[PDB]
Design a protein around this nucleic acid. Structure first.
Lengths: 98, 93, 108, 84, 108, 93, 84, 98
DNA sequence: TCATAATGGAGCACCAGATTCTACCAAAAGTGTATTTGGTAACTGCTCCATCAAAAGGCAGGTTCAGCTGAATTCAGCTGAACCTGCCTTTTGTTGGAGCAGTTTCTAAATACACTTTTGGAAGAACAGGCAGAGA
DNA sequence: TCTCTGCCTGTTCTTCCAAAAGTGTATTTAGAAACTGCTCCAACAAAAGGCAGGTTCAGCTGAATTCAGCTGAACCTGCCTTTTGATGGAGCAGTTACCAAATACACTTTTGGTAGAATCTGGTGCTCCATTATGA
């Protein structure tokens, strides 16, 4: 059976997902998460569908940017694998982390 | 009377919290900058809140929501408590 | 003519309700300004001022000084999580930094 | 319908991997998925808190796209394509 | 009685000078708005719009597409240094990211 | 009802830069957001400039200085050129 | 007056080292000083450009502390203690 | 003669300059720099003394914060020495490079 | 982990520069009218959001299985630190000269504020042209 | 990373209604001129403390190797999502009839700003510690 060497399919995936623009999280679980978070601030909240879509667009843009920073921090440490410490450093220098 | 500042009121508040403590002139300048900056933040957010909801008037609801949006966590709770208490006392008079 | 009573004294505040009302009216923040908006804003500004000054006077007491200086304001702001959040993009002139050496840098 | 709980785990590992691939990440630690879920939950909490504050000020019960747009813009994360 | 003509036509603009003047007056920016302020602002808005639209149409043509889409606006903005700087804190819905793989990740 | 937008003027500008290119409605929404965002930036900075210099009027000087403060480099240069050309054309009428 | 006399070198190596020490830095590469000079030159260029735009709008010839405070606030770097 | 080992005086200085608040760049050289790079408004600008002092306070605050971020990046790469690449990573995560 | 230097902290005395604390005074905040408009307060339509049900089909989850990357250990040279001179550049204290930033009349642009009048732009509907959906 | 279909959707024509245009007046605002006092700039000088350079040399950085951990890649399955289609009603937006409440205008009084003097707190020398750092 054919096997691609590690990182070949990863590079193909990088190209595929940087080429496209669609949302990479599933809409229904993200909506459930959004409603779950929101019920701590007010009960019996309703959401416009476009509100949930705005939240998902903003969240995915934020996470893609944070992953770009994380990959830079991983490369600075002479690694290719991103680790939680890379996310932590990117967040610290962004001012998101104390 | 040419300039105006919060020094008088900052010093009243200081004598309230710390009777025996003074304040430097540079510290008073920083406190003035702080009060002006926070006033600008809250007033601007209240202005935007009124514009969003198509209202002509900035009320204490706009100020309260601006405080909630701007201040973090427990600062917002205690600021809202103080503002509501102040408006209640003012209205009773 | 009843003798004048300041709106700050009516609200039980130290900060100026009338000046705050005039500054709201003069800042082009909106067409109109309610009667309780200056009172609320003065109360919030006084609360925040009292918070910072409490912490700064505590810092002044720690350093055995009887007078607050910009260093003490900086210490109070940066040692408080919420004030540091509020004033995270603010520079305090002559305030310095918090003493903090990364543990990796200390002698073995 | 029962009240929602534990919906962060619906941000699956493959979804996080896709978001990482769009970020140019070739290799991912196994511990990145829980870290990512925590970071996402904090971001969503911050944005939804402001969105609900805007919703409550307007005396509405529905959170609209403009409330989200205002909450994001308030945080320096301006979003185009949903109003404004 | 002259038959009236838009201030955009007088200024030689496509963007609405009258609407922009009304938005300036009603936006609570100042108590007065000058006559040439809306003309200047509408001209600047038209210039920036044309700049972005030219780059986005170039991107659309490169993609063999006859129509601009949020992806083309994203590509135009992020491939241009000035527009990227101006719109650096902005996320465009359904614009994606620029294709960019770090050189060290490519096959060794 | 009957909300306003810049769609008409953005399509008029597009027909100038690219006569044969169209634009999707989502792209036009992005462009409306862009125009309103930049209008708010310029207008807010011009309001601040008028306040700083203790003026009541926002004139084309305020818009010019706001454009210079807000746009970068060549964008600011070309935008100032365009606004000045527009105002010179408008006043000559 | 106007000066152009290579005085970015007036921001000396010991001064940059002191700034690094207040930043918690224990060991400094010898290439850090020219890097820091470039970074400071860029930062100062941005702030002074905004400050002089503010000065020119006011039709003044003198750059005042308020112009600098406004430029810094515009850059996202609010400063207390100079009349804000 | 007495010799302190490397890093001992460096740590003493870290404590010294984190304890203090005085400006760490000489005033006159910084004033010359400020007047020099005012190539904006060619020419003949005057400066208030407090204008240059506000500039210097902002500049030193900016550099101290940037050195804090640089030191975090250096530690993340398992180093004690800050290098130009650490400054570059800090400025890129901050959004200053682009 | 035993003694010697080097450093930073901590008592005292002596200022001297800054805070407090008073007095005047003028600018601005209360008082109190009229008065006008913005903003609740019902009272509906009407949209839109929220449950349900139910078929595909795609996606995610769990198992290998192996390759490759992260992590450690070692080693060596390099480079940065600590120190000591000798220099030089800043800092501070003076003049002085000049520019220029604020303060006051006065006037004349230019802006706001009202009508009616037309025009432009925002809803709708009708239609064909992109372009996503598949054919190797 | 390849032609032709068929649907979605962009473009484009009609209403009509909101708003932008032209007059016609009134009036603040801002520009212009003048004038003053407040910095700002610019030289001179003179201590002295930062700084620059050179020297050792100790520790850090980087390179090489090994190897175990881990994580990609592929493959089955299961599941869950997603896409219709109802429908129940929840709530949001629009239309009236007020009315509270904010604006606007004199007038008065008070309060906050600006000088001015006194004390007095913080800095600054000296000095005595008490830590730390550094090898036999």
């Amino acid at each position: 059976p054919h096997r691609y060497r590690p990182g070949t399919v990863a590079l193909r995936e990088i190209r595929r997902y940087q080429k496209s623009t669609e949302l990479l999280i599933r809409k229904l679980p993200f909506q459930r998460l959004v409603r779950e978070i929101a019920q701590d601030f007010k009960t019996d909240l309703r959401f416009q569908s476009s509100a949930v879509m705005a939240l998902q667009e903003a969240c995915e843009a934020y996470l893609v940017g944070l992953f770009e920073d994380t990959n830079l921090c991983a490369i600075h440490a002479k690694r290719v694998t991103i680790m939680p410490k890379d996310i932590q450093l990117a967040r610290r220098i962004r001012g998101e982390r104390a | 009377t040419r300039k105006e500042s919060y020094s008088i009121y900052i010093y009243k508040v200081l004598k309230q919290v710390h009777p025996d403590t003074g304040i430097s002139s540079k510290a008073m300048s920083i406190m003035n900058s702080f009060v002006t900056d926070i006033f600008e933040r809250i007033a601007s957010e209240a202005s935007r809140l009124a514009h969003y909801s198509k209202r002509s008037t900035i009320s204490s609801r706009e100020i309260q929501t601006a405080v909630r949006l701007l201040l973090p966590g427990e600062l917002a709770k205690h600021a809202v408590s103080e503002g509501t208490k102040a408006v209640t006392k003012y209205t009773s008079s | 003519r009843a003798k004048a009573k300041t709106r700050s004294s009516r609200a039980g505040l130290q900060f100026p309700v009338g000046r705050v009302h005039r500054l709201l009216r003069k800042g082009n923040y909106s067409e109109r300004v309610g009667a309780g908006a200056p009172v609320y804003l003065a109360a919030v500004l006084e609360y925040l001022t009292a918070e910072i000054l409490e912490l700064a006077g505590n810092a002044a007491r720690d350093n055995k000084k009887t007078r607050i200086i910009p260093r003490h304001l900086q210490l109070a702001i940066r040692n408080d999580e919420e004030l540091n959040k509020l004033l995270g993009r603010v520079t305090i002139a002559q305030g310095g930094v918090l003493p903090n050496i990364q543990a990796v840098l200390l002698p073995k | 319908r029962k009240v929602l709980r534990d919906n962060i785990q619906g941000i699956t590992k493959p979804a996080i991997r896709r978001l990482a691939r769009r970020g140019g990440v070739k290799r991912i630690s196994g511990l990145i998925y829980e870290e990512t879920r925590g970071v996402l939950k904090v971001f969503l909490e911050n944005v939804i808190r402001d969105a609900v504050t805007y919703t409550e000020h307007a005396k509405r019960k529905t959170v609209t796209a403009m409330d989200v747009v205002y909450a994001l813009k308030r945080q320096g994360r301006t979003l185009y394509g949903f109003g404004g």
